[PDB]
Amino acid sequence: GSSGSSGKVSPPEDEEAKNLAEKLARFIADGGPEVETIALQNNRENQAFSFLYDPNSQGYRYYRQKLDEFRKSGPSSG
């Protein structure tokens, strides 16, 4: 239960991901603590949606960002 991160990192290599990642967040963002559950719990079975877990991957990061970009809930910067 915390926020942070701010770009810096670079985008992924797999284009389909750059889209999937965004989309995911874009969607999970349209939802809340529920979508992040069904979307995740479900994504689990799905392999393509590995960028959600796979930390090593850069997509994961880029994905989260979009999540914050959309979510928009925390007047913090630093």
Deposited experimental method:
NMR
What is d(CA 42, CA 73) in angstroms, rounded to the nearest whole number?
25
Domains of the chain: 1-78 (1.10.10.790)
Angle at 28 between CA 71 and CA 30, to 5 degrees: 65
Question: Do 24 and 49 form a contact (C-beta atoms < 8 A)?
Answer: yes
Cα–Cα distances (Å) from 1 to 19, 33, 74, in that order, read 26, 12, 12
- In whole angstroms, what separates CA 9 from the centre of its chain? 13
What is d(CA 10, CA 62) in angstroms, rounded to the nearest whole number?
7
Residue 28: CB atoms within 10 Å: 24
What is d(CA 8, CA 10) in angstroms, rounded to the nearest whole number?
7
Residue 59: CB atoms within 10 Å: 23
DSSP letter at 53 equals: T
